[PDB]
Each structure stands twice: as structure tokens, then as C-alpha cells.
Write a protein that holds these residues in place. Structure first.
Motif, short mmCIF file in Angstrom:
data_model
loop_
_atom_site.label_atom_id
_atom_site.label_comp_id
_atom_site.label_asym_id
_atom_site.label_seq_id
_atom_site.Cartn_x
_atom_site.Cartn_y
_atom_site.Cartn_z
N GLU A 1 0.83 -1.20 0.00
CA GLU A 1 0.00 0.00 0.00
C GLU A 1 0.87 1.25 0.00
OE1 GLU A 1 -3.28 -0.59 2.97
OE2 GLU A 1 -1.96 -2.30 3.36
N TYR B 1 -8.01 -2.01 -7.82
CA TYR B 1 -9.40 -2.15 -7.44
C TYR B 1 -9.95 -0.96 -6.64
CZ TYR B 1 -7.34 -3.75 -3.07
OH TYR B 1 -6.60 -3.83 -1.91
N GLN B 2 -9.08 -0.03 -6.24
CA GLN B 2 -9.55 1.15 -5.52
C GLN B 2 -8.53 2.28 -5.41
OE1 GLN B 2 -10.74 -0.35 -1.70
NE2 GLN B 2 -8.68 -0.18 -0.79
N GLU C 1 -3.99 7.12 -1.97
CA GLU C 1 -3.58 5.72 -2.07
C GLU C 1 -4.29 5.04 -3.23
OE1 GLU C 1 -4.01 3.55 1.56
OE2 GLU C 1 -3.55 1.62 0.65
N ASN D 1 -4.67 1.04 -4.74
CA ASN D 1 -4.39 -0.36 -4.41
C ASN D 1 -4.53 -1.28 -5.61
OD1 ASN D 1 -6.10 0.77 -1.68
ND2 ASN D 1 -4.01 0.00 -1.40
N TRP D 2 -3.71 -2.33 -5.62
CA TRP D 2 -3.77 -3.35 -6.67
C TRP D 2 -3.50 -4.74 -6.09
CZ3 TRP D 2 0.62 -0.23 -6.33
CH2 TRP D 2 1.86 -0.89 -6.23
N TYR E 1 -2.31 -8.28 -4.84
CA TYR E 1 -1.06 -8.92 -4.43
C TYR E 1 -0.61 -9.97 -5.46
CZ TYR E 1 -3.64 -13.12 -2.93
OH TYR E 1 -4.41 -14.25 -2.88
N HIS F 1 2.23 -0.35 4.09
CA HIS F 1 1.85 -1.61 4.74
C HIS F 1 2.03 -2.74 3.74
CE1 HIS F 1 -1.39 1.29 6.50
NE2 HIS F 1 -0.22 1.49 7.08
N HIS G 1 0.68 -6.63 3.08
CA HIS G 1 -0.14 -7.79 3.40
C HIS G 1 0.60 -9.01 2.91
CE1 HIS G 1 -4.21 -5.96 4.41
NE2 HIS G 1 -3.40 -4.93 4.23
N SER H 1 1.20 -13.43 2.78
CA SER H 1 0.74 -14.81 2.91
C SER H 1 1.76 -15.76 2.30
CB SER H 1 -0.64 -15.00 2.28
OG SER H 1 -0.63 -14.61 0.92
N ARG I 1 -6.01 -1.22 13.60
CA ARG I 1 -4.96 -0.49 12.90
C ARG I 1 -3.97 0.23 13.82
NH1 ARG I 1 -9.22 -0.51 9.14
NH2 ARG I 1 -8.54 -0.50 6.94
N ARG J 1 -1.47 -6.09 11.97
CA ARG J 1 -2.92 -6.18 11.99
C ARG J 1 -3.31 -7.48 11.30
NH1 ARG J 1 -5.83 -3.46 7.64
NH2 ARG J 1 -8.11 -3.77 7.83
N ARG K 1 -4.08 -14.07 6.11
CA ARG K 1 -2.99 -13.14 5.87
C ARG K 1 -2.66 -12.27 7.07
NH1 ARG K 1 -7.27 -10.46 2.95
NH2 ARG K 1 -7.42 -8.22 3.38
N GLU L 1 -1.11 -8.31 8.12
CA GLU L 1 -0.74 -6.99 7.62
C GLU L 1 0.38 -6.41 8.47
OE1 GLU L 1 -3.05 -3.53 8.56
OE2 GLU L 1 -2.60 -2.63 6.66
N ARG M 1 2.19 -3.34 9.33
CA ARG M 1 1.91 -1.92 9.15
C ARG M 1 3.14 -1.07 9.39
NH1 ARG M 1 -3.13 -0.40 8.74
NH2 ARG M 1 -2.88 1.60 9.81
N1 ANP Z 1 -3.80 -13.51 0.79
C1 ANP Z 1 -3.09 -12.27 0.58
N2 ANP Z 1 -1.76 -12.21 0.75
C2 ANP Z 1 -1.08 -11.06 0.56
N3 ANP Z 1 -1.71 -9.94 0.21
C3 ANP Z 1 -3.05 -9.94 0.03
C4 ANP Z 1 -3.77 -11.12 0.22
N4 ANP Z 1 -5.06 -10.84 -0.01
C5 ANP Z 1 -5.18 -9.54 -0.34
N5 ANP Z 1 -3.96 -8.99 -0.31
C6 ANP Z 1 -3.61 -7.62 -0.58
O1 ANP Z 1 -3.62 -6.82 0.58
C7 ANP Z 1 -3.77 -5.44 0.13
C8 ANP Z 1 -4.82 -4.76 0.83
O2 ANP Z 1 -4.73 -3.35 0.91
P1 ANP Z 1 -5.95 -2.44 1.35
O3 ANP Z 1 -7.14 -2.77 0.41
O4 ANP Z 1 -5.55 -1.01 1.22
O5 ANP Z 1 -6.44 -2.88 2.80
P2 ANP Z 1 -6.30 -2.23 4.27
O6 ANP Z 1 -4.77 -2.50 4.36
O7 ANP Z 1 -7.24 -2.98 5.30
N6 ANP Z 1 -6.51 -0.54 4.04
P3 ANP Z 1 -5.70 0.65 4.94
O8 ANP Z 1 -6.69 1.47 5.97
O9 ANP Z 1 -5.13 1.62 4.07
O10 ANP Z 1 -4.51 0.12 5.86
C9 ANP Z 1 -4.04 -5.49 -1.32
O11 ANP Z 1 -2.88 -5.25 -2.02
C10 ANP Z 1 -4.51 -6.88 -1.51
O12 ANP Z 1 -4.39 -7.31 -2.79
#
Ligand code: ANP
Ligand code: ANP
Ligand code: ANP
Ligand code: MSL
Ligand code: MSL
Ligand code: MSL
Ligand code: MG
Ligand code: MG
Ligand code: MG
Ligand code: MG
Ligand code: MG
Ligand code: MG
Ligand code: MG
Ligand code: MG
Ligand code: MG
Lengths: 429, 429, 429
Positions: B121, B173-174, B185, B187-188, B190, B234, B236, B238, B311, B316, B322, B324, B326
Motif C-alpha cells: 500500500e 481495485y480502488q 492511495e 491499491n492493486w 497482491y 503496509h 499484506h 501470505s 490499525r 494487523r 494473511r 498486515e 503496518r
Molecule cells: N492472501 C493475501 N496475501 C497477501 N496480500 C493480500 C492477500 N489478499 C489480499 N492482499 C492484498 O492486501 C492489500 C490490501 O490493501 P488495502 O485494500 O488497502 O487494505 P487495508 O490495508 O485494510 N486498508 P488501509 O486502511 O489503508 O490500511 C491489497 O494489495 C490486496 O491485494
């Protein structure tokens, strides 16, 4: 001593009843001569929380009780008489007040027939009133120390202040331009620690006041310019018996006694915590361990070490019968500084502390050649060391914890300030 | 893959053969299509000492060998094709190069049938080209997060970049306005760690480039404004088997497996050293443990702890399967970051590390209520932790020591810079 | 409804998934079309504390589930589709979210075969982008209401927006210059409360956006100029059965039914608390009870009273079959406003509240002539009244308490600001 009578004899119309708070700020009331007799006995009242004493708005008034022996007629304005004062609270001297803290340690030492005498070297810069630059645009050369031209260009200010010290009986004996452009030093005779502390407090006030009258400004800031030498406040130290003998005077190395070396052992042993007190600002840590200046040396301590007549150490032995602690800077509190130093020294004497081996090297050049302990690198680490140092913390009493609280608050404030260097070097990350 | 043929089919006139140095700086040569076939096989030559790789002017050329799979036609200028590259030296991949370091850790994990997939992110601010202010003078409200007005006021830049990511197949996606005025921000999806790392490197370059074309400027600086939320990055995380199963997916708390929690245990255990890598600038430490912002929260980690969908922690747990992390910020190296995280996680899995107890509290409010370990408070302390962390230092190979040397140099430079706060608060000492 | 297919058909590239927070701020994510199907089902995620929702940073994401019926292709940018959304938290609609709170009240009313239909008069000023003055320096006359010249001077903005409302099927029917210099109004057909609330929210965003495109700025601020008429948001109100009959239509005075008068009775009875919601800013109280303007009348309420076709009261009876609540201003939340109005109204009906005696006088001139309760004079008192009003507080649920917390914080901030009038009138005390 009868201040009212003296007021009449000497033409004093107002007295400044003055105390120094934990942060070194001079606090005072200006009282007309008609009220001095009552004030001398009962003290001048203040709301302690409004100064740096770590009290509460809800606490009763503190009463600053003036020391009539400290009286100084302001030489630039003799109608006003300055008095140093002990802060009292609830009927007793207040242990958080610096002058009281110092007196307590002095009494302990005196009870063992040991009397601290010290001299202070209060280097300062003369700068533009707005703080933008040094006062003298022609003072530019790479090695300006002892520059005759630049010294004489500020003759009027320097000579005026020196003449005041002559008249006050301080035994001043030299003035010069110091090692940074814009920087000066004026020296006077050492004395009983309390006398020097009072003089030290007054001196800063005098220099700032006279500088202003000349349309200049004085600063004791430790490191006002990144590339130039900073403002030290070295203290020369000796311990005397009541009968008038210097206990540091001896037959050991360099004319020093085992008592002197045990005292030095205290300084070395407690150096980490001591740094918090005598280097009390964030900015202090830019004077210590500083990169080399345009003049070729910082002249300030980097390490917890001592040498002979050698200015590259925490401690210098300048001559027989005394130590020079080169650690403190221009921000050091005139009372907490001798108090902290004494507490550390006394403990060195009581434990027969070993100061270690004298280093006859240039520590700036050959610091790598030897294994030496570095001084604390920032305020927060120095404060932690203060708090963990029982002798020091206990010697200063409640002043230590109060001081530490304030300095932590300053650190939290500072550590959040964005700097230009960060912007310049991080924006393109 | 045949880059010359592709150049002809797609109309690519020049390739950027690009690598990321230790400090994250994109280094590249622009080579015309006529020369790509030779460059793809033999690599593009560079004097390694001229980038942040900790070499010597006397060393032979490094050769950056492009990964043909990484090819991206610059969507804003399709005549140029960008290639990520592995730096080679003396015939082998160079362990100090971030992309090489990452690949080494990936291979170790892959040998145990564990494949890191992550999403990043990359929050950023849009600012005036001169760095003086954010790009939008009307974006001023105390809580600007997700502001529709301010988001749409920068629609043209945001939508352009998002459409590029659509076309590149990143699965964006957003997009939104983030919590600080001026901050955004996008996002795309993973992907395999190497894919995300390459994309991450390209993304920053793309955002900066498109911002410029619109007369704006993008910054990923961790904390560009003292009173506003900073730029996080951040990750994410897995771990997957080759057969396509998510090992973090489980029956334990919050839909996580013991493998996931042992990985988390590695993150917790190695957090101190990990901080040096993923918070690699002096400025990083003004984002971590920051005083509360105008929007009401910093949203960044203060402590070495984890929560659920919460958060206010270092880690997180956003959803089943998965983690996160941060901790990292916008300065984090796109390769060293996953590499460092993986090394720490793998060791957690191998030692069955216990992450400790989940904290379902607001750590900003109730950090005092519990005993929790604070993160390193400054770069120098974080770097010391890196050096003392065998798993981390050994996992990153020679990159770790090289990184540490550079960061120490930056610290020595920074610690000597005089700040305005110091002048304002010390001049009158 | 199939949002993915509609995107393909209508050429929508991005969706704004939007919700309104407690302070009326529009919050949104811009999502590319490739992601809409997932988002429409699962919702778009947000950190709710970052908006005015009264949550905690440690809370789980809220999920904004868009209402596909609310879709609007931005008429000035048809590649973008706007969606109004319900905020959900932990699996349920989040009661602090204004649109959710409104649906809750509509549902109670609907269970009794009473359906609120309303129309809004969203008066606005067109100003300079910097906000220093109105957009038209030639608009200066004392009575500028319905000025033909100044209206046609802004024809391009006004006509563009009105034509958008034609195309959107809102049934716009008139536009004019309003009673203050710089002020305008564009009216459209009433509808079911939820439809009108969504339109209200969109309209404000449309006006602001289109103004900006013309180099202007729109503001809905209640009282932007001390001497000019302020921005109202009158709501016209009627209650209908599912069968399609207007329950307010009657044989009583002025063509109103007893149900209409009992509804009115709730409005009058609950006015003090209703004021906090529909006049929700400090500045709101400079529109209410204002000194006479340059145009001769404030046209806003001073008292909890009602008249016939008479613009000097809290409630006006404009025609047979409806009430006009003249109380709300341009800051009123599009969702909380009908929600709080409906709660007061339903209670009036159930208790058969007596609205009192209709006053057929000019309340600005003959206010003294009669005993009449004044409206709360400032935000703090209105909020206190909201809190003490069980029907209203209970009716709006947690939204009311949260709203109240935010407004008290606003008041605490405001009451400490020094004003120029104070300096002018007090410096010489
Ligand atoms: N199983 C996974 N393993 C690793 N990454 C993933 C997995 N599933 C989803 N993601 C990714 O995790 C990211 C999520 O980012 P985001 O949609 O901004 O969520 P958030 O971190 O809860 N938002 P924020 O308030 O900004 O911290 C995206 O890049 C997803 O594609
Ligand atoms: N026995 C003593 N005990 C304590 N202080 C003394 C003693 N003898 C001399 N002093 C004082 O030590 C101070 C010496 O300062 P100074 O003349 O500036 O010497 P220096 O420290 O070698 N110069 P510098 O290059 O600036 O560090 C004076 O205040 C002296 O009065
Ligand atoms: N039965 C009804 N129920 C609710 N709203 C209605 C009803 N009938 C008409 N309206 C709406 O009431 C609004 C009328 O506003 P407007 O045309 O500005 O009249 P006005 O309030 O007399 N003008 P003004 O001098 O600005 O106060 C429109 O939105 C109408 O659609
Ligand atoms: C050694 S010296 N020439 O006395 C200079 C001391 C220097 N200003 C200091 O920071 O202590
Ligand atoms: C929690 S959030 N709303 O995603 C903000 C994160 C914040 N910018 C950070 O420094 O990580
Ligand atoms: C009565 S009117 N002519 O519609 C003016 C209304 C006024 N702007 C108000 O504050 O409600
Ligand atoms: Mg000297
Ligand atoms: Mg000197
Ligand atoms: Mg000296
Ligand atoms: Mg995110
Ligand atoms: Mg974010
Ligand atoms: Mg995140
Ligand atoms: Mg109207
Ligand atoms: Mg009107
Ligand atoms: Mg009206």
C-alpha cells in the motif's frame, strides 16, 4: 546585613530579588527600597509552578529569601541592587531550587572539612539582535581565535564589562576573542563555589544586558553554528580545608594529590549522568562529539577520559592543584553544575575511585588508537543515565527528578520537529 | 523471451535497463532497440561505486542483466520499455543488490515449498513541484480521509494512473484520498513477492512521472508534515505452496493457521532489526511513535505488538489467511523490505516462534494499560539492532552490512544539522 | 441490479462509492469498473474513525455497501458513476451513519403506512475561489432578489446544472437569483425521503464541482455575510399512504388534515432539539434570529411558531396538503434532517400534538405583540436540548449522541477564538 540602610547610603531605589530556576532562567521581582526590610526577612512571594520548579498551580506561594551578602549594585544602573535568593516552600528551603540543592551538597562536604572552590569560563557569542548572524560581519577568517582586530572592534562592550568586574572585586584578569567567529571569553578569579555560582548567574545577566545597551545580543547557546566552535563553560575545580590548604595540591603525577585523583575518579565514574546536568539541552549534544570545525578543532570533549595539559579530553589537568572539567557548556545551570560535579567528586573521594590512565594523545586524531568510553550522544540518553545514577540523583535531591521530567518533555517536543535536512534528502525517496 | 522481436512488434524504440540500489534509487541506462539483444544476454555495464551498492571506484563494472519477464511499455510513453534487472559482479549475482538479495531468500523459502505473496500500500502525497506545500490549497479540513471533493479534484492524475494499472494487468481495485491533506492511495492485487517488488519499484516511478506531466509532484516521504499523518507502506503477507494452497489459512484464532502465527512470531521476534530495513530513513522515526495528528490518529505503529482487525499495532490481522505488517513506510526498499520480512518470518516458522498475546485495544489510548515493548526510537538504534540480529543480517547477506554503513553515514550527517527549534529555544540560555 | 453490465453499456470507467458522515462530509472511494461487482456485494472498506462517525482507530473496517438504485453518471463527466451507500459495521448497518439512521425512521413510519415525501430548497452563494467575496462584483443593489441581470450573468453555470437535473429526471422547474447578493436557488420535484436525501447529497457535490469548472466556488454556508440574507434549506413535507394518498390533504384550515396538524404539533413541540440537527453549526445561529438585512428581511425563523402562506415563521403553510419547515439551513445533513424531522412528526401524530394557534402576522415586526417561545440562540443550547429530547435522541439513536459529541467539541474550539470585535471594543477597557 541591613539592606534598608545600605539602600539609603548607596542610593539604591529598587532591589531585584532573584532566583534561578531548574532551567537556569533568572526569575525576579523588582521591589522598591521602602519594602526591602520586610522582603529580606519574609522573602518575596511567587507562584512556583510559573517557573521551572516542577510544582502545581494549587501549591502555596514559594518565598524567595534574599542573601544579603550577594548584593550587587548593577554597575550599568547603580540605582538597582541585585540579590540572589533561596527559594523556600512550606517553611523550609525548597530542594528543587538549584541554589538550595547546591548549598545542601556544599554543607555535606563542609562537614568533612572539604570546601569546593571553582572558576567558570563562560564563553559567549555576540550576535545580531535578531539572532540571524554574529554581530561583526568583518570577523570571517578560518582561524579567528585571539584575533586582535576583531577583539578591538568590540572593545567598548568588552572593556565596559571587564571594568565592572574590576569594580565588583571579582579579580578579572583577561579577555579575548575565542575560537569561533563572533565569540568571546572574559575570565575572573575562582572562589568558594557559592560565590562563583552567584557571580556566574549575575555575569550572564550582565553580559546580555550590556550587549543590549550597545544594540548587540549575547548568547551562551552551546552550538549556535554548525561549522564553528561551540560555547563551553569549563570549570576549574579544587578542594580546600577550612584552614586554607588545597587538598588537590600533591606529590603525585602533575602536582596532584591522591585526593585530587579520587575526586577525578568520581568525575570519570559518574560522567554519564553528570553529562545530563552540565550539558542540559538538546543542542548541547551538537557541541559534544562534533565534526571538525573550520578552525581545525572542536575543543570539546568526545570521550570519558582525561589528559595532562591537554584540551582534547573530558578533563584537563591545567596546572598543579586543580582539575579542569571541560564537559559543561553555556547552558549549564550555575548552581546545579557545581552541585552535580561536587556530588560526583565527593563520592569519588569516599570510594577512592580510580580515574584510570591519563591519555597524552590528541583524542580527535587518535581516539581510534585507544579503547575509550564515549559520552552520551543525546539528551535523552544522558537523562536516562542521570536517573540511573544513585549518587548523583540522591546528591541533587528532588531537583534531579524534576530536571529529568522537564528535559524529557523538551525531548518529546524536539523529536517531532521536521528539519530541512530531512525534507531535502527524503522527499525523493 | 526475445526482446528485439518484441521491440519490433510493439514499437519499442528504447529500453530502460533498470536496477534498484540499496537506498532505493532507480538506476538505469536508456538503450536503443538495436542494442537490446546484446544487453539482454551480457547485461548493461555500470560503475557500481557511483550508485548505493558500497563498492570501490577501482572495482570492475557491474553488469545489470534485465529480466525479460518484467518488461513494461511505459503507458504514458509506449515507445520506451522498462526492464527490472539483477546486478552481476565478477560473473555472479551481486549479493549487495536488493533484487538479488530478495531472490536469494525467495529461493531458500521455495526450497521448503513456501512461496511469499504480498501486496503493498504505497501511500503518497501530491505536492507543489518546489516541495513547499501540498498540491491542493483547498484541501484543508481536519479530517480529510476519503474526501470526495479533494479526490475528484485530482481525478485526472489518479484515473490516468489507475487506468495504466488496469491495462498492465495489475488488478487495481480502488483509489482514495488518504488521512492527511494532500495524500492518496491506489491499491492493486497482491502477487508473488518478486512480481510485487518489481511492480512496487515501477509504481513509484510511474506516479512521480505522471504527477510531473500534470505539473504536480509526488512524494513517498514517511513524514513530510509534522502535524499530519505520514506515508505508510503496509505489506499484506501470505505463504503459499506450489500447488496453490495458502499456508496462513487456518482453524486458529481469526482464521489463521499455526504456520501463520509462527511467521508472526518471527515478525515480532525480529521487529527491532526489521525496523531498520523497512523504516530506513532518519525521517522514518518521525512517522513511528508520532504525536497525535490533526485528524485524530497517526495510524502508524508505536509498539512491537499485534491486534485483530485493528490499525493501532505493528501487525494487523485484516481477514483470514494473511497478516498486515503496518510497520514499513514510503521509503522502504521494494526488494529489501520483502526480503527482510521473509527472513524474519521463515525463522519464526522454523523456530515455532510465539508471537505472544493479541491485544484488542487502541494502543494510542491504552498503551499505558499494558506492558509492551516500544519500537526503536531512531535510525541509529534501529541499525544497531539490525547488525546484532544474526538471522536478519545473515538472511540479507552482504546487503545488510552495506545498508548499515550507509545509514550510519546519513545519521552522522543529520545529527550535526542545526535546527530552528534549537535556535528558538536555546539562544537565551 | 447489475452494475458491471451497466458499466459496459454506459461506458462507465470508475465508480464513486460514496457515503455521508455525521458532519455532512462526502466520503468516497473511486473504484475502476473491473472491481464494481465485488464491491457492490461485499462493500468498499474504510477506516471509520478517519471520518465523522465517532469510532475508534482500533475498530474493524466499516464496509460501505452501495445502493445500485442510486446510480448517477456524473453529467459533467459521464465516465464516472456515483453511488450512495449504507455504512455497515461488524455485519450490520451502522446506526451512527446518517443514511442508515434515516432508513431506520422511514421504516418505523412505513410500518404504519405513512411515507415521508419531501423537497429541499438548497440555496447557495457563488463566490470567489478564495472565498473573500461573491463571484460577481456587479451584484450590489440593496434588494437583489430575482435580479434578472445578475441571474443571466451566471446563466452558463445555472443552465448547465439545471439541464443536468432535467436529464437526470429530477424534474427541475425553476431557478433564480435569491435575496442576498451572490445567492441563487434551483428547485426540483419532491420525492420519497430517501430519494430526495440522495439527490440533496448529490446536488451539493454537483453545484460545487460545476462552479469550480467555471472558475467559481459554491458555498452552502448558513450565514456567510453578516448583513446579507443567509442560506436556508427549507423542506416541504407531506405524508403519503402506500396507496398513494396525501394524508396531509384535508378539510381543516388552509386545506390541511388533522394528521397534518398533529404532525406540525410534533415539529413545534420538538423544535428546540430539532434545531441542533437542522441548524448544526456555530454559524447557523447567525442566520436564525438575525438583525434585519440590507434587503429588509432575514426570511429566516426567530420563533417556534407557524403561519399560513407566511415566510416569517418556523413553519409556513404554502398551499393545501403540505408544511414548509423553514428552520433548516444549508449546513443541515441531507439524511439527519429528514430523519429528525420525521421523528418529531411521527411523535406529533401519535400523541395528537397541538401545534397551537396560527399567527397571521409579520413576526419580524409584531414579535413583541405576542407571547412566543424563542428558538435556541446558539449551538451549545440547541445541542443540550437535543440531548434532553427523548423522542429525538431515541429516534435518531446513536447518531444523535455522536452528533452531540462532535458539536460540543466544535463549540469548545470556537468559544476560545479571539474575535476582532473584542479587540476593537475591549483593548481600551
Ligand atoms: N492472501 C493475501 N496475501 C497477501 N496480500 C493480500 C492477500 N489478499 C489480499 N492482499 C492484498 O492486501 C492489500 C490490501 O490493501 P488495502 O485494500 O488497502 O487494505 P487495508 O490495508 O485494510 N486498508 P488501509 O486502511 O489503508 O490500511 C491489497 O494489495 C490486496 O491485494
Ligand atoms: N586552584 C583553583 N581552583 C579552582 N579554580 C581555579 C584555581 N586556580 C585558578 N582557577 C581558575 O581557573 C580558571 C582558569 O580559566 P582560563 O584562564 O580561561 O584557563 P584555561 O582554562 O587553561 N583557558 P581555555 O583555552 O579557554 O580553556 C580561572 O577562573 C581561574 O581563576
Ligand atoms: N406535497 C409536497 N410534499 C413535499 N414537497 C412538496 C410537495 N409539493 C411540492 N413540494 C416541493 O416543495 C418545494 C417547493 O419549493 P419552492 O418552489 O422554492 O417554494 P417556496 O418554498 O414557496 N419558495 P421560497 O420563497 O424560496 O421559500 C419543491 O421542492 C416542491 O417540489
Ligand atoms: C579550547 S578553547 N580554545 O578554550 C575552546 C573551548 C570550546 N569553545 C568548547 O566548546 O569548550
Ligand atoms: C490506517 S490508514 N487510514 O490506512 C493510514 C496509515 C498511515 N498513513 C501510516 O502511516 O501507516
Ligand atoms: C424567504 S426566501 N425569499 O425564500 C429567503 C430564505 C432565506 N435565505 C433563509 O435563510 O431561509
Ligand atoms: Mg579560558
Ligand atoms: Mg576558551
Ligand atoms: Mg578552560
Ligand atoms: Mg490501504
Ligand atoms: Mg492507507
Ligand atoms: Mg493497510
Ligand atoms: Mg424556494
Ligand atoms: Mg428561497
Ligand atoms: Mg421555501
Amino acid at each position: 546585613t541591613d539592606l534598608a540602610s545600605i539602600a539609603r547610603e548607596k542610593g539604591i531605589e529598587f532591589f531585584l530579588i532573584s532566583f534561578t530556576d531548574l532551567l537556569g532562567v533568572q526569575r525576579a521581582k523588582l521591589v522598591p527600597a521602602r519594602a526591602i526590610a520586610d522582603m529580606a526577612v519574609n522573602g518575596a512571594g511567587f507562584a512556583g509552578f510559573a517557573a521551572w520548579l516542577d510544582m502545581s498551580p494549587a501549591d502555596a506561594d514559594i518565598l524567595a529569601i534574599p542573601d544579603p551578602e550577594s548584593l550587587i549594585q548593577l554597575p550599568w544602573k547603580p540605582s538597582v541592587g541585585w540579590l540572589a535568593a533561596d527559594v523556600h516552600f512550606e517553611g523550609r528551603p525548597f530542594p528543587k531550587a538549584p541554589r538550595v540543592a547546591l548549598k545542601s551538597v556544599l554543607a555535606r562536604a563542609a562537614g568533612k572539612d572539604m570546601h569546593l572552590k571553582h572558576g567558570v569560563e563562560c564563553e559567549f557569542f555576540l550576535i545580531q539582535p535578531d539572532g540571524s548572524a554574529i554581530s561583526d560581519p568583518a570577523d570571517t577568517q578560518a582561524k579567528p581565535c585571539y584575533d586582535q582586530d576583531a577583539l578591538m572592534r568590540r572593545f567598548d562592550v568588552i572593556a565596559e564589562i571587564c571594568s565592572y568586574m574590576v569594580d565588583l572585586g571579582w579579580g578579572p584578569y583577561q579577555n579575548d576573542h575565542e575560537d569561533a567567529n563572533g565569540q568571546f571569553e572574559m575570565n575572573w578569579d575562582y572562589a568558594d563555589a557559592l560565590v562563583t555560582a552567584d557571580r556566574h548567574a549575575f555575569f550572564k545577566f550582565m553580559v546580555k544586558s550590556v550587549a543590549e545597551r550597545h544594540g548587540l545580543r549575547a548568547t551562551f547557546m552551546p552550538k549556535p553554528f554548525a561549522h564553528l566552535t561551540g560555547n563551553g563553560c569549563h570549570t576549574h575545580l579544587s578542594m580546600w580545608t577550612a584552614a586554607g590548604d588545597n587538598l588537590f595540591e600533591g606529590d603525585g603525577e602533575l602536582g596532584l594529590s591522591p585526593t585530587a585523583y579520587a575526586f577525578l575518579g568520581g568525575l570519570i565514574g559518574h560522567a554519564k549522568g553528570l553529562t545530563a546536568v552540565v550539558n542540559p539541552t538538546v543542542n548541547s549534544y551538537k557541541r559534544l562529539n562534533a565534526p571538525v570545525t573550520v578552525s581545525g578543532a572542536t575543543w570539546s570533549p568526545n570521550t570519558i577520559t582525561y589528559g595532562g595539559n591537554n584540551r582534547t579530553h573530558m578533563v584537563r589537568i591545567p596546572d598543579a592543584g586543580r582539575l579542569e572539567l571541560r564537559l559543561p557548556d553555556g547552558a549549564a545551570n550555575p548552581y546545579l553544575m557545581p552541585a552535580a560535579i561536587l556530588a560526583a567528586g565527593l563520592d569519588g573521594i569516599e570510594t577512592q575511585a580510580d580515574p584510570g590512565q591519563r591519555l597524552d594523545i590528541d583524542m580527535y586524531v587518535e581516539g581510534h588508537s585507544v579503547e575509550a568510553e564515549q559520552l552520551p550522544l543525546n539528551l535523552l540518553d544522558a537523562v536516562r543515565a542521570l536517573e540511573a545514577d544513585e549518587v548523583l540523583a540522591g546528591g541533587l535531591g528532588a531537583a534531579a527528578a524534576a530536571f529529568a521530567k522537564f528535559k524529557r518533555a523538551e525531548w518529546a517536543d524536539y523529536k517531532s520537529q521536521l528539519t530541512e535536512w530531512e525534507r531535502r534528502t527524503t522527499l525523493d525517496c
